Amino acid sequence: CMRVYITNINGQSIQSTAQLCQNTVTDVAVSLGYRELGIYCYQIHTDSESELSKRLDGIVAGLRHGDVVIFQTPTWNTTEFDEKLMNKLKLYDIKIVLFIHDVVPLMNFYLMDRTIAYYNKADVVVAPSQKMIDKLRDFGMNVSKTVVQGMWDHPTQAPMFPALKREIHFPGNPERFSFVKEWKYDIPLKVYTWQNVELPQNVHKINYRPDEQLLMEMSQGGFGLVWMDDKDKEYQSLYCSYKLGSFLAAGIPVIVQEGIANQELIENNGLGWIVKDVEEAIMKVKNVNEDEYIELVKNVRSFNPILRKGFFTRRLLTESVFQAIC
Amino acid sequence: CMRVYITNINGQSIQSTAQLCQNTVTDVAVSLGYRELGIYCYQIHTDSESELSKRLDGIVAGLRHGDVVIFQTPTWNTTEFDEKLMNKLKLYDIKIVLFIHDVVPLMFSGNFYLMDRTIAYYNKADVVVAPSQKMIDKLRDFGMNVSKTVVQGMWDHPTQAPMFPAGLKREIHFPGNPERFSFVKEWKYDIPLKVYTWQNVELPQNVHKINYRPDEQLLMEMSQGGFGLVWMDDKDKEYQSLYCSYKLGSFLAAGIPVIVQEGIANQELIENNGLGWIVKDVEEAIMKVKNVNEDEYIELVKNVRSFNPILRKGFFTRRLLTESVFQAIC
Amino acid sequence: CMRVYITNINGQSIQSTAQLCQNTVTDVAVSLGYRELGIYCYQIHTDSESELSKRLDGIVAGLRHGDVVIFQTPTWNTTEFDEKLMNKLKLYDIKIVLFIHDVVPLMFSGNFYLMDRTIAYYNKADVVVAPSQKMIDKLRDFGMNVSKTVVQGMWDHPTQAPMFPAGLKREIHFPGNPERFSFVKEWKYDIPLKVYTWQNVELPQNVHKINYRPDEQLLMEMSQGGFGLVWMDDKDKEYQSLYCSYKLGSFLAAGIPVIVQEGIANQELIENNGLGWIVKDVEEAIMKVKNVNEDEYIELVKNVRSFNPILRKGFFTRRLLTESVFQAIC
Amino acid sequence: CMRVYITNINGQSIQSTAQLCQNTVTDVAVSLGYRELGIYCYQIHTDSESELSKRLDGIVAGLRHGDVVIFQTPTWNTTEFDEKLMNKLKLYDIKIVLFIHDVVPLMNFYLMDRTIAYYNKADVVVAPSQKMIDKLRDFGMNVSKTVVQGMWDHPTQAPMFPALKREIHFPGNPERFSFVKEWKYDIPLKVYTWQNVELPQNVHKINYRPDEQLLMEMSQGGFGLVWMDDKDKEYQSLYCSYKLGSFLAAGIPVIVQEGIANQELIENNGLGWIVKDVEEAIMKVKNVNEDEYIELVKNVRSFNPILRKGFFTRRLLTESVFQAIC
Numbered sequence A, D: 001c002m003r004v005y006i007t008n009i010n011g012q013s014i015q016s017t018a019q020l021c022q023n024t025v026t027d028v029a030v031s032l033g034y035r036e037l038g039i040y041c042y043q044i045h046t047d048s049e050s051e052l053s054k055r056l057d058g059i060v061a062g063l064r065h066g067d068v069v070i071f072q073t074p075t076w077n078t079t080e081f082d083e084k085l086m087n088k089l090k091l092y093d094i095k096i097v098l099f100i101h102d103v104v105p106l107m108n109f110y111l112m113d114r115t116i117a118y119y120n121k122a123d124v125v126v127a128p129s130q131k132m133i134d135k136l137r138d139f140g141m142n143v144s145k146t147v148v149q150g151m152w153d154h155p156t157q158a159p160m161f162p163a164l165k166r167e168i169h170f171p172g173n174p175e176r177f178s179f180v181k182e183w184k185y186d187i188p189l190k191v192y193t194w195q196n197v198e199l200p201q202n203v204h205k206i207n208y209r210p211d212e213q214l215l216m217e218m219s220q221g222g223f224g225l226v227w228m229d230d231k232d233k234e235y236q237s238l239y240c241s242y243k244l245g246s247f248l249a250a251g252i253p254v255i256v257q258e259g260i261a262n263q264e265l266i267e268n269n270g271l272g273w274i275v276k277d278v279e280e281a282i283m284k285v286k287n288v289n290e291d292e293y294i295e296l297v298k299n300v301r302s303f304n305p306i307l308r309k310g311f312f313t314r315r316l317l318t319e320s321v322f323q324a325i326c
Numbered sequence B, C: 001c002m003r004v005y006i007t008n009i010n011g012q013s014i015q016s017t018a019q020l021c022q023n024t025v026t027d028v029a030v031s032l033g034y035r036e037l038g039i040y041c042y043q044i045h046t047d048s049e050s051e052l053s054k055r056l057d058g059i060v061a062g063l064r065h066g067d068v069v070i071f072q073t074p075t076w077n078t079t080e081f082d083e084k085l086m087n088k089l090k091l092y093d094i095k096i097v098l099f100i101h102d103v104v105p106l107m108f109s110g111n112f113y114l115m116d117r118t119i120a121y122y123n124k125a126d127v128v129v130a131p132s133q134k135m136i137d138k139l140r141d142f143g144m145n146v147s148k149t150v151v152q153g154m155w156d157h158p159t160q161a162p163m164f165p166a167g168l169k170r171e172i173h174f175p176g177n178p179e180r181f182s183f184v185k186e187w188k189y190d191i192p193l194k195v196y197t198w199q200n201v202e203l204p205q206n207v208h209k210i211n212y213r214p215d216e217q218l219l220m221e222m223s224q225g226g227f228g229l230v231w232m233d234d235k236d237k238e239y240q241s242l243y244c245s246y247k248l249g250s251f252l253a254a255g256i257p258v259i260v261q262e263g264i265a266n267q268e269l270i271e272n273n274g275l276g277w278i279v280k281d282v283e284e285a286i287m288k289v290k291n292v293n294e295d296e297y298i299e300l301v302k303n304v305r306s307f308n309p310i311l312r313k314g315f316f317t318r319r320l321l322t323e324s325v326f327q328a329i330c
Ligand SMILES: O=c1ccn([C@@H]2O[C@H](COP(=O)(O)OP(=O)(O)O)[C@@H](O)[C@H]2O)c(=O)[nH]1
Pocket: A017, A171, A172, A173, A192, A193, A207, A208, A209, A210, A211, A212, A214, A240, A241, A242, A243, A244, A246
């Protein structure tokens, strides 16, 4: 009697997006009848080899031959923890779905070989984009069955207010996104962060809050910006942005940089604009009229029940398990 | 706040496979949080037009703009009912998934005149789930223009029925009705054919007529060994290359290998998963059953029971129910 | 193979609390694997008798002997509709749970003549879920003879709305309609009353009229502090000792303490869980709000937010939906 | 955001009824959206104190303050494991429901004090019967909120055949039930066991099989016997018999010894007979006519959807969590 299990981290800061994504996916999994394998984030060097082995035995205690396990990677307990977890799993007669949230060596490059080595033990890989799959294959990943995630969902019941404020929201940490501290354009940029830092003139810093609260606020109008530093441009063209799903779930259109992964989703669903640089974005906002905006808003709100009800996640969770067996 | 609803027939004989299929899908759908729109099977001519309209209003009472509806077709209340239900649904600001269980104009040649009306209501859907890519291509030839399609691939068979060890019994199981499958009435081979049917008729010498039994009992009995035969009459060969067989799923869920004819829709599922034999004709199937050895049979059985959790947990159905709704929203 | 179904109204104004309640229960029921029987709110006089009969046939199309049905009453299609629905259900070999949301003959004195007809259809159920033990005792006085009863106790309020820190604001929240709650139009106290209503009317000097907002927004706003008032007009004092207040659940789910009148049904829930104050009259409530200190308020808020996961996860409802079905089967 | 967790053992023999009951309860819990804390049955003496501590940390890794945990006891890892698990749980700001499957010291009496000590750390206790609650209170249990289980469910889709064979079924191990090896009555007793033992004349031993298979067989008619040895009579008047639920789920009436816990369920629902001794039972079967049997069968099949759909378990799982908070 096959039971599907999914790993899920615990113990990170409430402000950790990594943990938010894993927990949200697990909430959806549980609603599909899948079972959680909880993982606490701690300092692995404090375990002896036998203590770590038995801690892992505690985590996997409920597993049986014939099950399927979805490994949400990474655990953020370091590569050693991820390798040793995958080793335990491979002791069972089960199929393993590797669900990639991040590829840390592409964000520590030297750890790529060890990472690829444990990736290859999986039966199916779910990756953010076809470009990321292709990239991993160039580094030796040879898992034959793959599934593309496409987009993060954003389950929520936040009310959507009627939507054209010529301003831009950016719910991201300025320490990770340096372009923030360099903002110089006259259109307002609202930075939602827990960071105790002062920023440029037209940047209006706002304190970190509940997601639900953010979404109501944003649904009133304007534009959502998805953007990365020059340092991270290579990774941005591979990953799925969590803030993208958040803008769309709020019910407003987005502005994303050309090259961002899965851009055809934005294009084919008319969810906003794909632009070359911030200058072109600032232009689009200053220049867009009301009827154009109304059109974009309608597209976004026609599309976003997928995000708000968790369907990107339901489909990858179902298709990956299916592929693992068939 | 989107809800997903799915239509589901009721009121047919217990032995009706059409209803078994819809009900099984609906049970899976409900486990996914989808809601049932129950439809009773009755004689539509007994309603005045306003009575039919208000009966349908009763069926769709819980629907709201912004929902998604999965219409399992046909309802078996006749094409007229199917058309009128789709009309009622299209009055709502919803997306519609058309889940094809059968296509009436293709099942029988004399009913081909219904094709235009069928295509016309089909074309009102946003997504079409069809048994096979070939069925999709054939429907497009007759004018279906729905841009989003999903291939079902195989019927599931959700169950927890125990599987007994499968012995190599040189016998063939066929839980189908002899009135629909004329080849059973002509069986002339020296391999026993076990026919499970409610039909009160005597059958050829080498056919063992077994009385209709509940699906769970059938599964348990079949799991004990032998082979499952999926086969159609000469009149039905075209549909065979198009449809998904329900008994195919049943054999596999029971844990025994199957025998099917070359050209059957979705045959690569059988090949790629090592689930049985694809044969040219009945004569070839008889030769394989007579000539298979114990090791080869153990292997087939291993492949089937390695594969069948997908069926017993309803994953062909979970994946189509999830993907079609996704595609419907875009 | 038993399925459990539950009726659920549709078609009322978004601001209709009756529909909010039924829908909220149904969402919980669906999470438990129960199936919806949708009912649309309409003008019953527009159906001929055969049309109404067949509309109902549409609503119950999916039902089978051996199911259990939970009838949330009233449908608000009038007593006549409620009686006819119960008649249709009693044609099936099923068990029926009657889930009382309101009792029309008790809400208004002039409608007391409806009591006999109401009791007569109530008596067709196998189990009755009622807001309070007092309501059960009162109904038995008017002839209800159903042997199995379940006490609801409190409305849940399933939600994930964020709770802001609750500041001690010396202000009282009342998300109710001034047309139904005349006391709001007479407010003369120096503590501000925040009234959330779609009603286009000006209100007394110390009443802050706030426009109707979606429940999630209301919850978030109320969580910021103050007190929630549950109160009825003099004409409604008898019903108060009988019913469950929906806004009571809303205040608690928002994470603020409440103020209620002595004698309100199920008042021990408030007392035993330290959720607010039970007062003699409005004057006493004003005195408490003026005189409460920060520490005492922090304590109340701690008690409320310790208790409210039961509400936000819908456990009063899960327990009545589970226990009533159990009792129905015996 | 409160999440309900439930413990569940793994690693016992497929023939272990203890594990069957825990797994069945957990399957129902999962359908209610509760989450499993898997526990593997192993030899505790092989762990050092720190290894056991971290194994337990692995088991409870997903827990958070504000959750509710249902502890199905015992784990069968020995009392030390149960005590130390309860200790871990008490480090969290959670409510604990203790769901008693067995009380091992009443089945090792000397371990009662330690057992009662860890029981008392729970917020709510679910016990098989009010008599068991009263008994535990006489040994010092002072948990204020209690819930009575009443009966084991028996979720199943086994077909029920039409039901009057004057024979008696007993799906129980003769090593535990010695009265089996002493059977001497002329009415057939069918013993379903994996035990490789030969038995008296009118005892027809049958090999252990899938439950689903057993139930179809039994639904054809006759009577189900629930009975205990003289050694176990005191415990029988406290516990919930699993085989009782099995007979009823099959769709035939039962014969139980006077004094068995929760006997009013049998009486009030007309599910069979409560008798003084085997002699009276043998009499009832020999003497019952068809119309009486038809009546009993109808009662049983009117009642058994509760068992077959898991409602005794759904109600205790829901009511205990409710009581834990209110
Ligand atoms: O005040 C805030 C600001 C941020 N966020 C959440 O944090 C996310 C952004 O985190 P991150 O930058 O790490 O996501 P990324 O787009 O890089 O994947 C947003 O989508 C929000 O959902 C929030 O809940 N409250």
